[model samples]
Target: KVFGRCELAAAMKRHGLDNYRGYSLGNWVCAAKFESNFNTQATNRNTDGSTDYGILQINSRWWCNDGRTPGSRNLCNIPCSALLSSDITASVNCAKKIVSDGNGMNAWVAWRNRCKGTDVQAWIRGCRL
Candidate 1:
């Protein structure tokens, strides 16, 4: 699913991303925008032979069990494919875990490079929620 900017913001807010781990809804939305452009099926292969999956682009090496990453910890305890579903519940839940695990939003390079220290409000402009 390709979510619109506001749509993604609302969804993330509903999933408890607003101010999650000291990151605002805009921060999550901004990261998702750069990570996957709000597309649920987005995937990217890393130079380390691991893959990033789904909207927030959770890493297979540390987050999900893709059965491919050699040292996968599967800390999220869910299949990587689950993050690709349009439902987004799994993706959101895993993201929360990632933040709660002490990594915070810095887990995503996109967040660090694009959203961090920037005015992220533009990522959620005009969104009622």
Candidate 2:
């Protein structure tokens, strides 16, 4: 799903992501922007022969799969194509598991490489939520 920035902010805030693990909503929003621009269908093929999935771009190396990609650990026990959908509850659930697994948002290279330390206040500039 494609989200207008504030629309996503509202959804994420409702999901309690604004304060999850002490990270601000902007941090998550910034990471989402760098990862998939709020597109739930977002996907990327990594150089390591794995694929990244959905808005958070969870990896195939240890996450979901399509049965054709190599090194798929299927830790989430969901199909990779399931990640490419408008309804993001599953992806969000999976991301929570990922973050709680110890790596947090650092699991996504886009977040590490781009969103770190950036003031992303504008990401939620207009929505009251």
Candidate 3:
């Protein structure tokens, strides 16, 4: 049950999604908390068998774009498919890209930011508690 920003960021770094857009360490940590509740071993049930797999609970086939290696589909948490893709880091990267494509980090940025008031960020922040 990871609960610290540093810890979460380190985990993301290990997965290889630390850089993207204008995302910040604080934002990345916040997102991880919400996605998996800091449960690196989190999983979800799909069928009688062990469906979705990995720390981020990525679907098995749908999001298998890239793996830990070539054709492995092993991104940060998981690939990124229907029932086998975590794409946690990938998702964050998308958001980071959005932020980075705008004004400098500040109150104005916050206002013009496209991801403001998003559930993911707020949800992750809750994990801080």
Q: TM-score per candidate, in order? A: 0.96, 0.89, 0.39
RMSD of 2: 1.5
lDDT of 3 by residue, 1-129 (tens): 434555556656665544444454445554444445555555555453333433333443333343322333333343444222333454444333334534432212323343345543442353322
lDDT of 1 by residue, 39-126 (tens): 9999999999999999999999899998988967899899999999988899999999998887688889899998899999988888
Off-target runs (Cα >4 Å) in candidate 1 are none
Task: Say which prediction, candidate 1 or candidate 3, comes out ahead on lDDT.
Answer: 1
Q: Given candidate 2, what's the lDDT at residue 121? A: 78
lDDT of 1: 0.92
Tens-place lDDT digits, model 2, residues 26-68: 8888888888999998888878788888878878888897676
Which stretches in model 2 have alpha-carbon errors above 4 Å?
A: none
Ranking by lDDT: 1, 2, 3
Cα RMSD (angstroms) for every candidate in the order listed: 0.9, 1.5, 9.7
Clashing pairs in 2: none
In terms of lDDT, model 3 sits at 0.42
